[PDB]
A paper describes a structure:
In human mitochondria, mitochondrial Hsp70 (mortalin) and the nucleotide exchange factor (GrpEL1) work synergistically to stabilize proteins, assemble protein complexes, and facilitate protein import. In bacteria, mitochondria, and chloroplasts, the GrpE-family of NEFs interacts with substrate-bound Hsp70 to facilitate ADP and protein substrate release. Herein, we present structures of full-length human mortalin in a nucleotide-free and substrate-bound state in complex with full-length GrpEL1.
Thus, we mutated Y173 in GrpEL1 to an alanine (GrpEL1Y173A) and performed cryoEM analysis on a mortalinR126W-GrpEL1Y173A complex. We term these structures mortalinR126W-GrpEL1Y173A and mortalinR126W-GrpEL1Y173A−lid. Overall, these structures closely resemble our mortalinR126W-GrpEL1WT structure and are similarly nucleotide-free. Firstly, our mortalinR126W-GrpEL1Y173A structure harbors EM density for the entirety of the SBD, and similar to our mortalinR126W-GrpEL1 structure, appears substrate bound to another mortalinR126W proteolysis product. Critically, we observe a large deviation of the SBD in our mortalinR126W-GrpEL1Y173A structure compared to mortalinR126W-GrpEL1WT, with the SBD of mortalinR126W-GrpEL1Y173A translated ~6 Å away from the GrpEL1-B β-wing. Firstly, positioning of the SBD in our mortalinR126W-GrpEL1Y173A structure suggests that although Y173 in GrpEL1 is not necessary for mortalinR126W-GrpEL1 complex formation, it is key in mediating interaction between the β-wing domain of GrpEL1-B and SBDα lid of mortalin. Secondly, the presence of the full SBD in mortalinR126W-GrpEL1Y173A suggests that interactions between the GrpEL1-B stalk and SBDβ subdomain of mortalin are sufficient in stabilizing the entirety of the SBD. However, the presence of an intact, substrate-bound SBD in our mortalinR126W-GrpEL1Y173A structure suggests that interactions between SBDβ and GrpEL1-B stalk are sufficient to maintain the closed SBD conformation proximal to GrpEL1. We also observe that decoupling the SBD-α:GrpEL1-B interface via Y173A in GrpEL1 results in a change in dynamics only for the GrpEL1-B β-wing.
Residue numbers in the entry:
A (entry chain D): 435 to 441
B (entry chain A): 46 to 639
C (entry chain C): 59 to 217
D (entry chain B): 59 to 219
The structure:
Amino acid sequence: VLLLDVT
Amino acid sequence: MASEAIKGAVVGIDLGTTNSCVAVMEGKQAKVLENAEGARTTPSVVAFTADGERLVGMPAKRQAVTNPNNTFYATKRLIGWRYDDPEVQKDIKNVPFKIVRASNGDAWVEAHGKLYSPSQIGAFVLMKMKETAENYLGHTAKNAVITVPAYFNDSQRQATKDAGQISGLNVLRVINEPTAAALAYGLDKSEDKVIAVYDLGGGTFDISILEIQKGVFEVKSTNGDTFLGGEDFDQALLRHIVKEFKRETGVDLTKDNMALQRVREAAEKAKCELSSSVQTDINLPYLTMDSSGPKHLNMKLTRAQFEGIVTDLIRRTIAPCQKAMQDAEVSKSDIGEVILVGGMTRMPKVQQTVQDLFGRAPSKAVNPDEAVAIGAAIQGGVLAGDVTDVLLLDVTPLSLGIETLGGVFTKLINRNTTIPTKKSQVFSTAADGQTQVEIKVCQGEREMAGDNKLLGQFTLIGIPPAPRGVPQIEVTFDIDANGIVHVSAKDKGTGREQQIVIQSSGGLSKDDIENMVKNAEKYAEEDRRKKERVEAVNMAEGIIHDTETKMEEFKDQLPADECNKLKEEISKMRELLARKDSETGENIRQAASS
Amino acid sequence: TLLEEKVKLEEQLKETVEKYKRALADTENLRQRSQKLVEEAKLYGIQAFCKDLLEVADVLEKATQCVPKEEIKDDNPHLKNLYEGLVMTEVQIQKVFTKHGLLKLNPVGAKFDPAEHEALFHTPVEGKEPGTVALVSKVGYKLHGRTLRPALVGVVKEA
Amino acid sequence: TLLEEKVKLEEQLKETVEKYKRALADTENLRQRSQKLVEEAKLYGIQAFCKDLLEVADVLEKATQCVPKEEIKDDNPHLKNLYEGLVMTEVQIQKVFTKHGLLKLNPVGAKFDPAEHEALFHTPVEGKEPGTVALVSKVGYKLHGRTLRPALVGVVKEASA
């Protein structure tokens, strides 16, 4: 449910 | 007439007797442009060659020795004056270049049998300045606001306007130096007051008593010393240094040439240093060469010694200021503020003299070297540009963003960002098979999710199944004017969008701008360290999950007992002592080949 | 009919004013980014200059220090003048470095710090705290609070 | 009053549209100028540091030329080591200078160019063409076409006859 970050 | 539709760039060319400066309005704060050589002040020297040239500035100061009869310098003392004038008659004797009378009986200058008015020399200097402004800006700078001394009568102001017109500049208005200084200090939007400007440090000392009634500046009185400037102070310090060297050793540097220049530069550096520290050291190794051996200068100079060397020069600025007070019909109690302009006004003795002379603490907020240029730039920007529109443009009080899977706080918009902006950033799913994505919007400056604040929360529900990293979600902030932030999350490819109108976007406008930022800078290295640690943990667990997924795909004839680096990776994970796990992330072995 | 003109003009005014504020707020962010880029470029250039400038100071310091202070006497004038010139040049170099941010690092007796101090060797020394700089083999330098070159020092161990 | 009010407001609409056009022009100009200024601050930008190290370099050169070069023998070993250390410092600082474009200006026989040479005397010199450098009283320094210190030269003058 926790958004990720695109590298 | 109607709106002139200037729609151009306005520059303030501070045309001085010896040095000049040009400034532009870079949005909300003015900026001083550097010339081709990287120096902010262009010398106002125009030199002509044998066949024909127009060398202006340092390429004209350098050549002056070989061409002393064609180097026109300090010509702003001849502008607007007739040939038969006492000041011109005293000036003609000293200046090497020829001064001739024009057809109209005006004091002009001569170069290789050609007539040059004192306005044309200023025109050439203005041309150099416009070339510099075009080099920086990129486009043509057509409109300009030139500055003249406060005692320039109508004829000399008209001559300056003619000089500005000759150089291809649209001279909006010709401004006074004290008015420009007041604008630079910020007294345009001020109540009724009587201010005095203290101009010491150039080729002349000027003191002018200004009034700011109704919002316009009226110069009540002007005064000052003509033969007093910043060169005399440097010469006094140099004379002291050379006398002390001769006393200590016995060699006089006046006969020398290179040693004199070295001593002059050291004296200038020490004088510029004797304004923030009590003492200074002057070291000039291998200053002179003698039969008995080289001699090295080494002098310590205290602030009291320098204040005693030049106390007569400072005290010579006491009578003209008092007479300016008397003529303006004001006393120490009627002066509302004192304005310091000039390079030597940073010396605490000079400011002490001004305070003792007006009864007011002088304002030292604007660099006195570049106050006239910046003030002219501000006035020009107000006159024809659109800068007050940027002034009312509010800025974001504190940075915004969203949460991250590893607890990081991604900065989508920084702290000091103008309010009417839109910004977007793509993001992927947390893990494989995830269909629920939640967004946590918070405001703060620390590199942590919940350590600053929490504006609100919303969940973007509904994602098609896909492996981790493939789905793309566009979290875009649509903060409009008047601080109305429209946080919206967009799922690229499919529907099910989300959008919120979170309030309290800087509603609690207080000292929080300066006190949540004060403790954020001290707690920065530790915050960066813990953010790096959590990022290391995140990529370590991602790598270990990928390795586990690849291992659980291939099992037959797989002797992966030597491939148990996941155990040591986990052991390092449960260790709050190592710097980072990036060097230990070499756990992506795929010798099984699917 | 004519009433629609007021509504259309008001809507167009609102949209155009918002779009104008958007246009005038993007240029400010672009200008701030430009200033940040210029600052970073200048800082990197100056750091590159300092990394090469350190060696001159190191060489001059070693050359001057290698001469013992006992032999500088009036019966050897050529060495005395040269030594005075060299020490004055060294302090001039250090003054110019300090003026432009390049600060020295001579933590004599200060606590060990991995950010600025590097432990060349470990050896217990009587009278000094554990993990304390007893000696400095090579001097370090700092730039604007960020260590440009860690100081090579000796760390007191436990005996 | 309604019609004139509408006309004035439409005129304001056209004015703010043209203001938006000017804003687009302004931001494009700002982009171009930023791209130029980053390059300017990359090539140059060490100008203060170089302008302050010029005097250290000149002092080291004067120190190298100071010693009479006849007393540097094995009789005085510590003067030998110190002189070699000073010469090593000189060559190291000259290698560091030219790595960053800091080229010395030593125009012993070039034409007098006011953009890089600060004339000191106009002495007449026989056998030399007018407009050249009779001697260099101090070597100049420049980086990337931006002179930092003119070479203090002495030009020659035509014969009075």
